[PDB]
Amino acid sequence: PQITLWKRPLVTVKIGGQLKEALLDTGADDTVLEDINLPGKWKPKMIGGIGGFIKVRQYDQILIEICGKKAIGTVLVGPTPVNIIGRNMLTQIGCTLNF
Amino acid sequence: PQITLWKRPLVTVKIGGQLKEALLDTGADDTVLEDINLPGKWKPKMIGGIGGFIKVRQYDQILIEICGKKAIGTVLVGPTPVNIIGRNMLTQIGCTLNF
Ligand SMILES: CC(C)CN(C[C@@H](O)[C@H](Cc1ccccc1)NC(=O)O[C@H]1CO[C@H]2OCC[C@H]21)S(=O)(=O)c1ccc(N)cc1
């Protein structure tokens, strides 16, 4: 799919048997979700954005399926106001910007 | 240009005779710059991100040139940690996501 940007680039993602919506986000280095419980071990981490920093759980080697394309990688879990798919996943699904 | 996302999608922007670097950011509704002083009237506004909110100056009908393509629109000026080119400008330069 080529997608234009007149609306938020929201996609459906399947992660851990759950269905979520998340923003395809070229401005995000990493993938961060809020409304989700992922099992197993994880390491504490902080990430900063426009208003400062949030503490997140870092989970490694997590499978996600984004618009029906698979990727495995780091998913940060924490109090982001919007689920975001960051560059760490976007590259694995071959996502590019075009103008 | 088609742009892969292994590195931050940073472009050069010319605004008010000044040269800045900014991130092409599909997860941002609006365009927000920090290291810049634009002339004339503006309205107060707040925007939220990861970490919460910041107060910004809203400047309307501002000309920007991003990779030498012109756009005119709202530019928010405030303490963002990274200059961001948002969807309000991305649509004007014909930017799309592809995968
Ligand atoms: C959370 C998004 C839905 C919105 N953000 C745009 C987003 O692209 C920011 C844009 C951004 C970029 C750098 C610094 C601050 C904000 N990225 C971001 O917070 O990424 C974080 C997750 O991955 C990490 O990589 C960079 C910071 C971490 S935002 O910067 O807060 C934002 C919010 C509102 C407007 N109008 C414009 C921008």
Side-chain angles (χ1 to χ4, degrees), chain A residues 1 3-6 8-36 38-40 42 44-54 56-60 62-65 67-68 70-99, chain B residues 1-6 8-36 38-40 42 44-54 56-60 62-65 67-68 70-99:
Chain A
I3 109 174
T4 49
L5 289 163
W6 302 96
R8 291 188 179 223
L10 288 168
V11 290
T12 297
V13 63
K14 187 179 194 190
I15 178 177
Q18 296 171 261
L19 270 28
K20 304 281 154 186
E21 226 174 71
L23 200 57
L24 298 173
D25 186 355
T26 57
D29 295 354
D30 320 306
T31 291
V32 200
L33 288 96
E34 44 140 29
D35 47 347
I36 209 197
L38 294 175
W42 54 268
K45 187 185 154 75
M46 327 228 64
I47 57 183
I50 250 186
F53 278 69
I54 56 149
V56 300
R57 308 176 164 194
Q58 176 179 346
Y59 290 89
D60 299 323
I62 300 299
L63 175 67
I64 67 107
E65 202 169 305
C67 204
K70 280 164 195 164
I72 276 187
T74 298
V75 171
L76 310 184
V77 187
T80 180
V82 175
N83 298 332
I84 58 195
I85 305 314
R87 288 188 305 97
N88 78 303
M89 294 296 191
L90 294 176
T91 48
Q92 293 184 59
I93 68 181
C95 182
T96 70
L97 283 171
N98 311 270
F99 63 94
Chain B
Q2 178 170 72
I3 304 187
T4 53
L5 291 164
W6 301 97
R8 270 138 67 246
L10 288 176
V11 294
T12 296
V13 58
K14 184 176 185 182
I15 177 177
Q18 301 170 68
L19 304 178
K20 304 285 162 184
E21 210 104 60
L23 195 65
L24 297 177
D25 188 352
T26 59
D29 298 350
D30 313 306
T31 288
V32 194
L33 295 263
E34 197 265 313
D35 46 350
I36 208 168
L38 295 166
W42 51 266
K45 190 181 148 167
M46 322 223 308
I47 66 186
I50 265 182
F53 79 92
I54 59 154
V56 302
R57 298 183 170 181
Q58 180 183 324
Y59 290 86
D60 294 326
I62 298 298
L63 176 66
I64 77 165
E65 204 176 321
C67 220
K70 297 183 203 309
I72 177 155
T74 297
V75 167
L76 307 183
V77 189
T80 181
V82 173
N83 297 330
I84 292 139
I85 304 309
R87 288 189 305 94
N88 76 303
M89 295 295 193
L90 295 176
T91 43
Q92 285 191 71
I93 71 184
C95 185
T96 63
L97 285 167
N98 291 33
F99 62 92

